[PDB]
Tab-separated table of C-alpha atoms in Angstrom:
chain	number	residue	atom	x	y	z
A	4	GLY	CA	27.152	4.634	12.799
A	5	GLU	CA	23.596	4.090	11.551
A	6	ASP	CA	23.135	2.174	8.314
A	7	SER	CA	21.925	4.385	5.476
A	8	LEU	CA	19.142	1.888	4.734
A	9	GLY	CA	18.166	-0.935	7.051
A	10	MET	CA	15.568	-3.598	7.677
A	11	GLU	CA	14.710	-5.413	10.905
A	12	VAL	CA	12.700	-8.640	10.952
A	13	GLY	CA	10.961	-10.881	13.442
A	14	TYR	CA	12.066	-14.492	13.557
A	15	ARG	CA	9.420	-15.830	11.168
A	16	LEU	CA	10.848	-13.608	8.404
A	17	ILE	CA	14.460	-14.747	8.942
A	18	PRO	CA	14.270	-17.498	6.265
A	19	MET	CA	13.311	-15.121	3.442
A	20	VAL	CA	16.379	-12.994	4.322
A	21	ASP	CA	18.790	-15.869	5.127
A	22	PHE	CA	21.279	-16.589	2.339
A	23	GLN	CA	21.726	-20.108	3.751
A	24	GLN	CA	17.986	-20.840	3.483
A	25	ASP	CA	15.434	-19.817	0.846
A	26	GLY	CA	16.310	-16.119	1.066
A	27	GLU	CA	13.665	-15.197	-1.513
A	28	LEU	CA	13.577	-11.571	-0.330
A	29	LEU	CA	17.331	-11.136	-0.847
A	30	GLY	CA	16.909	-11.700	-4.585
A	31	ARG	CA	13.984	-9.278	-4.799
A	32	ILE	CA	16.056	-6.624	-3.012
A	33	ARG	CA	18.884	-7.084	-5.519
A	34	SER	CA	16.486	-6.662	-8.452
A	35	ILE	CA	14.987	-3.558	-6.810
A	36	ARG	CA	18.407	-1.938	-6.387
A	37	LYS	CA	19.499	-2.918	-9.907
A	38	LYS	CA	16.281	-1.512	-11.400
A	39	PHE	CA	16.724	1.814	-9.571
A	40	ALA	CA	20.319	2.094	-10.802
A	41	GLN	CA	19.366	1.334	-14.410
A	42	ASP	CA	16.107	3.284	-14.678
A	43	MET	CA	16.688	6.251	-12.351
A	44	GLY	CA	20.498	6.418	-12.480
A	45	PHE	CA	20.545	6.009	-8.699
A	46	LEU	CA	22.088	2.938	-7.067
A	47	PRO	CA	20.389	2.864	-3.646
A	48	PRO	CA	22.495	1.959	-0.611
A	49	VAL	CA	22.748	-1.665	0.405
A	50	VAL	CA	19.935	-2.753	2.719
A	51	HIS	CA	21.470	-3.951	5.988
A	52	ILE	CA	19.173	-6.666	7.364
A	53	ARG	CA	19.198	-7.658	11.034
A	54	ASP	CA	16.956	-9.740	13.265
A	55	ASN	CA	15.077	-8.013	16.089
A	56	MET	CA	13.454	-10.304	18.656
A	57	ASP	CA	11.341	-7.728	20.490
A	58	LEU	CA	9.634	-7.330	17.119
A	59	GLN	CA	6.591	-9.495	16.549
A	60	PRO	CA	7.390	-12.752	14.706
A	61	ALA	CA	5.901	-11.745	11.326
A	62	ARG	CA	6.808	-8.037	11.598
A	63	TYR	CA	9.434	-6.053	9.719
A	64	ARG	CA	10.650	-2.467	9.929
A	65	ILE	CA	12.435	-0.408	7.283
A	66	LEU	CA	14.798	2.301	8.488
A	67	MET	CA	16.852	5.165	7.076
A	68	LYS	CA	19.836	6.201	9.214
A	69	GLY	CA	18.225	4.407	12.150
A	70	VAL	CA	14.845	6.165	11.766
A	71	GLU	CA	11.858	3.948	10.987
A	72	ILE	CA	10.144	4.952	7.737
A	73	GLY	CA	7.927	1.893	7.261
A	74	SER	CA	6.699	-1.281	8.883
A	75	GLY	CA	4.208	-4.053	8.308
A	76	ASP	CA	3.320	-7.700	8.639
A	77	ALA	CA	4.305	-10.518	6.300
A	78	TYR	CA	3.060	-14.048	6.895
A	79	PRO	CA	5.282	-16.630	5.120
A	80	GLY	CA	2.484	-19.184	4.853
A	81	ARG	CA	-0.114	-16.835	3.344
A	82	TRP	CA	-0.831	-14.633	0.344
A	83	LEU	CA	-1.968	-11.013	0.409
A	84	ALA	CA	-5.125	-10.494	-1.662
A	85	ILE	CA	-5.198	-6.817	-2.663
A	86	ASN	CA	-8.356	-5.093	-3.912
A	87	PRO	CA	-7.135	-2.595	-6.552
A	88	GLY	CA	-10.621	-1.048	-6.696
A	89	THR	CA	-12.360	-3.631	-8.892
A	90	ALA	CA	-12.565	-6.758	-6.707
A	91	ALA	CA	-15.964	-8.247	-5.856
A	92	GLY	CA	-17.150	-9.668	-2.561
A	93	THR	CA	-15.015	-10.591	0.423
A	94	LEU	CA	-12.589	-13.341	1.382
A	95	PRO	CA	-12.004	-14.967	4.778
A	96	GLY	CA	-8.800	-14.044	6.555
A	97	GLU	CA	-6.965	-11.238	8.308
A	98	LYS	CA	-8.264	-7.999	6.818
A	99	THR	CA	-5.582	-5.347	6.432
A	100	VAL	CA	-4.172	-2.726	4.064
A	101	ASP	CA	-1.415	-3.143	1.505
A	102	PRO	CA	1.634	-1.270	2.854
A	103	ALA	CA	2.614	0.456	-0.402
A	104	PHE	CA	-0.682	1.905	-1.669
A	105	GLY	CA	-3.092	1.736	1.271
A	106	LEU	CA	-5.561	-0.452	-0.642
A	107	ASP	CA	-7.871	-2.810	1.237
A	108	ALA	CA	-6.454	-6.326	1.332
A	109	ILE	CA	-6.822	-9.684	3.067
A	110	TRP	CA	-4.245	-12.250	4.104
A	111	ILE	CA	-5.577	-15.562	2.810
A	112	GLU	CA	-4.660	-19.235	2.906
A	113	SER	CA	-2.961	-20.674	-0.171
A	114	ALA	CA	-6.100	-22.665	-1.031
A	115	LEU	CA	-8.031	-19.423	-1.689
A	116	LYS	CA	-5.488	-17.957	-4.140
A	117	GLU	CA	-7.458	-18.781	-7.290
A	118	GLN	CA	-10.845	-17.933	-5.773
A	119	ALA	CA	-9.431	-14.531	-4.831
A	120	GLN	CA	-8.126	-14.023	-8.376
A	121	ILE	CA	-11.558	-14.912	-9.773
A	122	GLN	CA	-12.946	-12.239	-7.438
A	123	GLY	CA	-10.534	-9.735	-9.008
A	124	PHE	CA	-8.005	-9.549	-6.169
A	125	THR	CA	-4.310	-9.080	-6.901
A	126	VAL	CA	-2.703	-11.956	-5.001
A	127	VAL	CA	0.955	-11.694	-3.957
A	128	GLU	CA	3.158	-13.815	-1.733
A	129	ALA	CA	4.659	-12.668	1.555
A	130	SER	CA	8.175	-11.867	0.329
A	131	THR	CA	6.709	-9.824	-2.537
A	132	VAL	CA	4.687	-7.746	-0.071
A	133	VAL	CA	7.891	-6.788	1.754
A	134	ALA	CA	9.809	-6.154	-1.469
A	135	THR	CA	7.008	-3.989	-2.876
A	136	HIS	CA	6.917	-1.903	0.298
A	137	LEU	CA	10.704	-1.452	0.226
A	138	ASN	CA	10.706	-0.547	-3.470
A	139	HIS	CA	8.010	2.046	-2.764
A	140	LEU	CA	9.922	3.577	0.162
A	141	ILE	CA	13.185	3.784	-1.793
A	142	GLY	CA	11.288	5.692	-4.476
A	143	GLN	CA	9.579	7.961	-1.952
A	144	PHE	CA	12.886	8.760	-0.198
A	145	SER	CA	15.159	8.734	-3.272
A	146	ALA	CA	16.289	12.330	-2.743
A	147	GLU	CA	16.891	11.887	0.992
A	148	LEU	CA	18.834	8.670	0.334
A	149	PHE	CA	21.031	10.497	-2.209
A	150	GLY	CA	23.401	12.261	0.151
A	151	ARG	CA	26.723	13.942	-0.459
A	152	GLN	CA	28.530	10.600	-0.189
A	153	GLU	CA	26.188	9.193	-2.831
A	154	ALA	CA	26.825	12.155	-5.128
A	155	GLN	CA	30.591	11.661	-4.807
A	156	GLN	CA	30.397	7.923	-5.518
A	157	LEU	CA	28.318	8.577	-8.654
A	158	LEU	CA	30.701	11.305	-9.817
A	159	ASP	CA	33.616	8.906	-9.266
A	160	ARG	CA	31.925	6.213	-11.368
A	161	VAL	CA	31.074	8.564	-14.236
A	162	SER	CA	34.635	9.930	-14.049
A	163	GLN	CA	35.831	6.504	-15.204
A	164	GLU	CA	33.766	6.706	-18.403
A	165	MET	CA	34.029	10.486	-18.976
A	166	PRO	CA	37.386	11.555	-17.493
A	167	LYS	CA	37.811	14.835	-19.385
A	168	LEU	CA	34.250	16.060	-18.860
A	169	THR	CA	34.334	15.445	-15.105
A	170	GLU	CA	37.806	16.984	-14.719
A	171	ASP	CA	36.942	20.333	-16.333
A	172	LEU	CA	33.757	20.651	-14.252
A	173	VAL	CA	34.287	19.640	-10.594
A	174	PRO	CA	35.313	21.457	-8.475
A	175	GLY	CA	36.563	24.342	-10.612
A	176	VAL	CA	33.262	25.049	-12.392
A	177	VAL	CA	30.593	23.457	-10.171
A	178	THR	CA	31.243	22.299	-6.623
A	179	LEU	CA	30.121	18.937	-5.306
A	180	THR	CA	27.666	20.880	-3.117
A	181	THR	CA	26.007	22.420	-6.171
A	182	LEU	CA	26.096	19.190	-8.194
A	183	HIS	CA	24.616	17.225	-5.299
A	184	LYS	CA	21.801	19.756	-4.840
A	185	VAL	CA	20.877	19.723	-8.543
A	186	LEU	CA	20.855	15.917	-8.698
A	187	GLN	CA	18.810	15.780	-5.487
A	188	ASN	CA	16.287	18.239	-6.934
A	189	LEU	CA	15.898	15.966	-9.963
A	190	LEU	CA	15.418	12.822	-7.868
A	191	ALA	CA	12.925	14.707	-5.677
A	192	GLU	CA	10.645	15.070	-8.735
A	193	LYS	CA	11.361	11.533	-10.017
A	194	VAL	CA	13.547	12.768	-12.891
A	195	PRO	CA	16.095	10.061	-13.827
A	196	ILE	CA	19.736	11.084	-13.463
A	197	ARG	CA	21.115	8.201	-15.526
A	198	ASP	CA	22.151	10.549	-18.369
A	199	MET	CA	25.032	12.148	-16.515
A	200	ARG	CA	26.672	13.266	-19.766
A	201	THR	CA	23.751	15.567	-20.575
A	202	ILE	CA	23.559	16.720	-16.944
A	203	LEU	CA	27.259	17.496	-16.614
A	204	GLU	CA	27.493	19.037	-20.093
A	205	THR	CA	24.549	21.301	-19.246
A	206	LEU	CA	26.086	22.312	-15.914
A	207	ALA	CA	29.375	23.034	-17.697
A	208	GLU	CA	27.630	25.448	-20.076
A	209	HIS	CA	25.513	27.279	-17.485
A	210	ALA	CA	27.293	27.018	-14.119
A	211	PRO	CA	29.809	29.730	-15.165
A	212	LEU	CA	26.825	32.023	-15.736
A	213	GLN	CA	24.454	30.916	-12.942
A	214	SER	CA	25.563	29.563	-9.562
A	215	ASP	CA	21.993	29.099	-8.297
A	216	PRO	CA	21.161	25.364	-8.030
A	217	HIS	CA	17.483	26.243	-8.503
A	218	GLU	CA	18.101	27.848	-11.897
A	219	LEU	CA	20.536	25.126	-12.956
A	220	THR	CA	17.880	22.536	-12.101
A	221	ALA	CA	15.409	24.208	-14.470
A	222	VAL	CA	17.966	24.300	-17.301
A	223	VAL	CA	19.000	20.689	-16.669
A	224	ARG	CA	15.346	19.608	-16.731
A	225	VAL	CA	14.926	21.185	-20.178
A	226	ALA	CA	18.071	19.395	-21.366
A	227	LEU	CA	16.487	16.144	-20.104
A	228	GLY	CA	13.079	16.904	-21.619
A	229	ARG	CA	13.110	13.868	-23.900
A	230	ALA	CA	13.800	11.536	-20.968
A	231	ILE	CA	11.164	13.296	-18.851
A	232	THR	CA	8.605	13.113	-21.665
A	233	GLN	CA	9.195	9.397	-22.308
A	234	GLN	CA	9.083	8.683	-18.562
A	235	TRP	CA	5.466	9.830	-18.179
A	236	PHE	CA	4.363	9.459	-21.829
A	237	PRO	CA	6.302	6.428	-23.112
A	238	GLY	CA	5.961	5.709	-26.799
A	239	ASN	CA	4.218	7.909	-29.344
A	240	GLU	CA	0.555	8.157	-28.361
A	241	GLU	CA	-1.355	11.294	-27.429
A	242	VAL	CA	0.064	13.158	-24.432
A	243	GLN	CA	-2.865	13.594	-22.016
A	244	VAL	CA	-2.288	16.199	-19.303
A	245	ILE	CA	-3.949	18.403	-16.735
A	246	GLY	CA	-3.872	22.084	-17.639
A	247	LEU	CA	-4.600	25.365	-15.901
A	248	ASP	CA	-7.650	27.393	-16.808
A	249	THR	CA	-6.452	30.324	-18.907
A	250	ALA	CA	-7.720	32.958	-16.463
A	251	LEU	CA	-6.028	31.202	-13.548
A	252	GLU	CA	-2.731	30.996	-15.443
A	253	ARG	CA	-2.705	34.773	-15.888
A	254	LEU	CA	-3.731	35.426	-12.277
A	255	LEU	CA	-0.736	33.379	-11.115
A	256	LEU	CA	1.676	34.933	-13.628
A	257	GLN	CA	0.715	38.478	-12.613
A	258	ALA	CA	0.992	37.586	-8.925
A	259	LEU	CA	4.612	36.493	-9.374
A	260	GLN	CA	5.227	39.571	-11.551
A	261	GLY	CA	4.081	41.997	-8.847
A	262	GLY	CA	0.716	42.658	-10.488
A	263	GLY	CA	-1.517	41.755	-7.542
A	264	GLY	CA	-1.804	38.745	-5.265
A	265	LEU	CA	-4.583	36.178	-5.175
A	266	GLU	CA	-6.834	35.767	-2.159
A	267	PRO	CA	-5.738	32.877	0.107
A	268	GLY	CA	-9.036	31.088	-0.487
A	269	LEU	CA	-8.156	30.782	-4.170
A	270	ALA	CA	-4.974	28.913	-3.205
A	271	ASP	CA	-6.996	26.424	-1.148
A	272	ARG	CA	-9.355	25.900	-4.095
A	273	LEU	CA	-6.392	25.530	-6.451
A	274	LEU	CA	-5.230	22.657	-4.249
A	275	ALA	CA	-8.687	21.084	-4.078
A	276	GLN	CA	-9.078	21.292	-7.860
A	277	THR	CA	-5.659	19.703	-8.386
A	278	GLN	CA	-6.764	16.708	-6.307
A	279	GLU	CA	-9.953	16.464	-8.376
A	280	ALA	CA	-7.936	16.604	-11.609
A	281	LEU	CA	-5.674	13.852	-10.284
A	282	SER	CA	-8.690	11.625	-9.608
A	283	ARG	CA	-9.927	12.291	-13.148
A	284	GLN	CA	-6.582	11.437	-14.766
A	285	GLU	CA	-6.587	8.201	-12.755
A	286	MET	CA	-10.140	7.442	-13.894
A	287	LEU	CA	-9.177	8.144	-17.525
A	288	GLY	CA	-6.027	6.035	-17.227
A	289	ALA	CA	-3.959	9.127	-18.085
A	290	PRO	CA	-0.729	10.180	-16.340
A	291	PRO	CA	-0.804	12.325	-13.142
A	292	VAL	CA	0.858	15.173	-15.042
A	293	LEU	CA	0.140	18.899	-14.843
A	294	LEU	CA	1.690	20.869	-17.726
A	295	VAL	CA	2.282	24.581	-17.096
A	296	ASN	CA	3.977	27.714	-18.370
A	297	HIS	CA	7.711	27.516	-17.669
A	298	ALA	CA	7.557	30.508	-15.317
A	299	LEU	CA	5.045	28.676	-13.083
A	300	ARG	CA	6.615	25.207	-12.897
A	301	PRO	CA	8.840	25.507	-9.770
A	302	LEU	CA	6.199	27.433	-7.797
A	303	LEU	CA	3.338	25.029	-8.504
A	304	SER	CA	5.569	21.961	-8.165
A	305	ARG	CA	6.525	23.053	-4.641
A	306	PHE	CA	3.096	24.439	-3.748
A	307	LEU	CA	1.069	21.442	-4.953
A	308	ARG	CA	3.368	18.459	-4.412
A	309	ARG	CA	3.665	19.280	-0.707
A	310	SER	CA	0.097	17.971	-0.313
A	311	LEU	CA	-0.065	15.784	-3.475
A	312	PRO	CA	3.341	14.116	-3.976
A	313	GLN	CA	1.856	11.913	-6.714
A	314	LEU	CA	1.451	14.962	-8.956
A	315	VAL	CA	4.008	15.565	-11.717
A	316	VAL	CA	4.442	19.209	-12.742
A	317	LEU	CA	6.108	19.683	-16.134
A	318	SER	CA	7.026	22.822	-18.061
A	319	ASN	CA	5.935	23.321	-21.653
A	320	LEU	CA	9.654	23.712	-22.430
A	321	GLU	CA	10.357	20.156	-21.211
A	322	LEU	CA	7.693	18.308	-23.214
A	323	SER	CA	9.092	16.991	-26.505
A	324	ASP	CA	8.003	19.338	-29.279
A	325	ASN	CA	6.957	16.512	-31.642
A	326	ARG	CA	4.210	15.189	-29.347
A	327	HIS	CA	0.499	15.868	-29.754
A	328	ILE	CA	-0.830	17.234	-26.450
A	329	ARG	CA	-4.426	17.038	-25.218
A	330	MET	CA	-5.600	18.685	-22.006
A	331	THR	CA	-7.832	15.965	-20.560
A	332	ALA	CA	-8.456	17.836	-17.288
A	333	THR	CA	-8.464	21.524	-16.363
A	334	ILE	CA	-7.687	23.098	-12.981
A	335	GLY	CA	-9.683	26.299	-12.517
């Protein structure tokens, strides 16, 4: 009954979503959905747009299965001047916060656009503010948006290109339930699922031996290690990562191996130090990537990303073996 993905708008935002008028936001939505399909392998559901007149005139909401996941203001006659961290001074206008990243921002008249840019502000128009927020929410909720129906539709599409591979695999070797869970686990850590041949071929080799979607996910991630490596370290420059202090690594390994647990305070400090390492990577311009021993990757991914979803936790078995790695930050 409820649309998988929906948007509600006050009356001032109707033009940017009206195919008979300017409809600028409709074209941005299409590019967002196309870019997710091509880059992540995940065609998001259509965004059902409807007017809502008890909403403020310049207000929009974004909803998933009828549950609001985001909202904000967009003023068609104004630009949003966003301070990325380097802007200088202030501008007159409605002070706010950019909906995607939480950065300080100001809605400004058109006549201040260039002045704001000279002051180092990133200046975007109203429809782009909404699009950016939607694009961010689709990314944040990619796994939740990829339900069983979505998994079936994708399997049906790939079946057209790879009929024999898909026939030998589902449902006799891996069920849709298991395939959906593995694909969801990949999307949950921002791993693209566009390379369905490698994914299905890997499941075909290991599903007969391991029915656990958790273990399949680890083996699929290794099979996709080149795509994962190029996602966070595109090109051929030095791979700059966070690493664990050597002593910490062994304390965690021996805790999972029944050799003695770590005091709870050490876990809290582990989390605090991961946040500090993230801030350092950001300051260095390096990726938000923590590289760890294969045996630790699922644990630390779940433990740390619960509080720090921006963190990427990779296994040493996933990182392309021809890359030069440098630990630019150390946790512990």
